[PDB]
Write an enzyme that holds these catalytic residues in place. Structure first.
Site, short mmCIF file in Angstrom:
data_model
loop_
_atom_site.label_atom_id
_atom_site.label_comp_id
_atom_site.label_asym_id
_atom_site.label_seq_id
_atom_site.Cartn_x
_atom_site.Cartn_y
_atom_site.Cartn_z
N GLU C 46 0.45 -11.04 11.81
CA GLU C 46 0.06 -9.87 11.05
C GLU C 46 1.22 -9.18 10.33
O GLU C 46 1.11 -8.85 9.15
CB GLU C 46 -0.65 -8.85 11.94
CG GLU C 46 -2.13 -9.13 12.14
CD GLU C 46 -2.78 -9.62 10.85
OE1 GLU C 46 -2.43 -9.09 9.77
OE2 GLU C 46 -3.64 -10.53 10.93
N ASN C 50 2.45 -9.28 6.24
CA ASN C 50 2.65 -8.01 5.55
C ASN C 50 4.00 -8.06 4.82
O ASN C 50 4.10 -7.66 3.67
CB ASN C 50 2.63 -6.83 6.53
CG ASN C 50 1.23 -6.46 6.99
OD1 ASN C 50 0.24 -6.95 6.45
ND2 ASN C 50 1.16 -5.58 7.98
N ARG C 105 -7.89 -8.95 0.87
CA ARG C 105 -7.24 -8.40 2.04
C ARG C 105 -8.23 -7.42 2.67
O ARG C 105 -8.73 -6.52 2.00
CB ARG C 105 -5.94 -7.70 1.64
CG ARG C 105 -4.66 -8.44 2.05
CD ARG C 105 -4.51 -9.82 1.43
NE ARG C 105 -4.84 -10.93 2.33
CZ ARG C 105 -4.32 -11.10 3.55
NH1 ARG C 105 -3.45 -10.23 4.04
NH2 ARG C 105 -4.67 -12.15 4.28
N1 ATP Z 1 5.90 -4.88 5.01
C1 ATP Z 1 5.22 -4.10 4.18
N2 ATP Z 1 5.79 -3.69 2.98
C2 ATP Z 1 5.10 -2.89 2.13
N3 ATP Z 1 3.85 -2.41 2.32
C3 ATP Z 1 3.30 -2.84 3.56
C4 ATP Z 1 3.89 -3.65 4.50
N4 ATP Z 1 3.08 -3.87 5.59
C5 ATP Z 1 2.02 -3.19 5.29
N5 ATP Z 1 2.07 -2.53 4.05
C6 ATP Z 1 1.06 -1.65 3.36
O1 ATP Z 1 0.17 -1.08 4.40
C7 ATP Z 1 -1.17 -1.62 4.21
C8 ATP Z 1 -1.35 -2.34 5.50
O2 ATP Z 1 -2.03 -3.07 6.27
P1 ATP Z 1 -2.80 -4.24 6.66
O3 ATP Z 1 -1.57 -4.66 7.26
O4 ATP Z 1 -3.87 -3.61 7.42
O5 ATP Z 1 -3.01 -4.57 5.19
P2 ATP Z 1 -3.76 -5.77 4.38
O6 ATP Z 1 -2.52 -6.46 4.43
O7 ATP Z 1 -4.18 -4.97 3.27
O8 ATP Z 1 -4.73 -6.08 5.56
P3 ATP Z 1 -5.05 -7.46 6.25
O9 ATP Z 1 -3.72 -7.84 6.80
O10 ATP Z 1 -6.16 -7.33 7.24
O11 ATP Z 1 -5.44 -8.39 5.16
C9 ATP Z 1 -1.12 -2.80 3.32
O12 ATP Z 1 -2.31 -3.17 2.66
C10 ATP Z 1 0.08 -2.42 2.43
O13 ATP Z 1 -0.38 -1.58 1.37
MG MG Z 2 -1.83 -7.31 7.09
#
Ligand code: ATP
Ligand code: MG
Ligand code: ATP
Ligand code: MG
Lengths: 141, 117, 141, 118
Positions: C46, C50, C105
């Protein structure tokens, strides 16, 4: 393609297996032979072990450093330690040569490295550390 | 130990060591201990090494093995290795220190060459 | 005892599998439940994803830095990147919130981290990077 | 060798049966999405069965590609039913009501019964 990885861990014997697993996974991306993979697993074992038992005389506070870069079918493996060093690198490369025979060391390490990989470069400075560069082209069907 | 299972069985003056898993510096230490441990509590003349279930081996394997070999030479007995994968055989031929140690196909042939089986 | 590891790798989707494999084999030394393991692999996947799709916006030249520290039955995961950063961490952590709707996502990532770990700390600064910390107690039999 | 995720696609007269095997993460997801929409265009499917029986791993990226195919098939008066869901996968589905929107059936034969094809 170009993919790089860097791994740092404690100079502990359990980690010899650890490095073998990690490196093998990273190099799997080149879909190599089982032999190629086994050869690559072995070599990583030889170098990491050396760093632990020779480089740090089994002191678990030492930091073994491995770094693999795979690109266009070739593997660039690097095992490094800020340990004791190798006084006469040329002598140490001789098959069966060892400085710890009372520890059932066979002196086959380097000979295995030089033969399981396409190229091996050993660099070292007494009391600074040792760095082993291993190259290897992965035959692709 | 870890990632290496040791199976020991003694037959009238012969120690049978069955390895299953990976054999490297770390795991070889556990093997040396466990074996020289039997050699201390019993009078062992020979050793039959079954590497049938041996997934991996680096130089440490050549080391621990030749380590036992010596313990046996001092008692006039002999050591027989069997069920050797090609990978292991390669490390044997490559080290060349195995023109000495006897190599058989299976545990029967090894034991047989010793006299037991 | 006090084993610790540090892994760094190109921000490329294949390395998600890689990181799972790596952190798993390292944490393996603690003999965890099948679930405990799956929970750790999952969470690493996860945070690393990200880093890759959000912090680096799929640019493989970015570097994801992982760090696992086992000690006294607890697992201490760390996942950082010198990426783009999170403007509102508070909002980013809310379930279903995502800034990449065009990329299918679901916005569940963070919620999965919170449900599978004993503690999740997200530190982030715009135009600097994001560092996620994850503490996981391992039921020792 | 191996493909991190195995994708067995079977077409039964207007029905698409997708059986996954292996790990389903971000990397692997893109591949699946690509292969599915590829069939949905070369043919006129109206029903989809997703067999996750042999699925070893799945992360949020799995939820995504699944929720995506759902929308995709739904926007064509079609239906999708997920079957053979391991406790692990299910545990993710239960993280948000949003996913209760996806029909889950025990085995495959019931997935089809749920689609009205058997
Ligand atoms: N490493 C990172 N750098 C920049 N923004 C981040 C990072 N990790 C998370 N985010 C931001 O926080 C939100 C986070 O969460 P999640 O991790 O729930 O997102 P998704 O990636 O949109 O979800 P999923 O992983 O279920 O597809 C993201 O959509 C993104 O906008
Ligand atoms: Mg994520
Ligand atoms: N990282 C290192 N630090 C210090 N000395 C080293 C290092 N790596 C190798 N050496 C020296 O090089 C000699 C050679 O190699 P090999 O690697 O063949 O040795 P062994 O470890 O003695 O043999 P084997 O690994 O077959 O048991 C060693 O005996 C050791 O003295
Ligand atoms: Mg060596």
């Amino acid at each position: 393609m170009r993919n790089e990885m860097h791994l740092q861990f404690s100079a502990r014997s359990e980690n010899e297996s650890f490095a073998r697993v990690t490196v093998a996974a990273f190099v799997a991306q080149l879909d190599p032979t089982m032999d190629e993979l086994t050869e690559i697993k072995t070599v990583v074992s030889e170098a990491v072990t050396n760093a632990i038992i020779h480089g740090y005389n089994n002191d678990p506070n030492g930091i073994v450093s491995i770094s693999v870069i795979i690109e266009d079918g070739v593997v660039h493996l690097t095992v490094r330690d800020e340990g004791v060093g190798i006084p006469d690198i040329e002598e140490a490369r001789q098959p069966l040569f060892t400085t710890k025979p009372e520890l059932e060391r066979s002196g086959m390490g380097f000979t295995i490295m030089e033969n399981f990989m396409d190229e091996v470069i050993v660099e070292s400075e007494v009391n600074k550390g040792t760095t082993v560069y291993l190259k290897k082209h992965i035959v692709k069907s | 130990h870890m990632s290496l299972a040791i199976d020991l069985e003694v037959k009238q003056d012969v120690l049978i060591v069955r390895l299953s898993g990976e054999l490297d510096h770390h795991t070889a230490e556990e093997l040396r201990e466990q074996v020289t441990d039997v050699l201390e509590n019993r009078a062992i003349r020979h050793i039959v090494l079954n590497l049938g279930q041996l997934t991996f081996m680096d130089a440490s394997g050549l080391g621990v093995i030749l380590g036992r070999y010596k313990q046996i030479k001092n008692v006039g007995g002999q050591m027989v290795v069997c069920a050797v994968s090609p990978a292991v055989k390669r490390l044997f031929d490559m080290s060349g220190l195995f023109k000495i140690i006897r190599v058989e196909a299976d545990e029967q042939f090894a034991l047989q060459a010793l006299g037991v089986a």
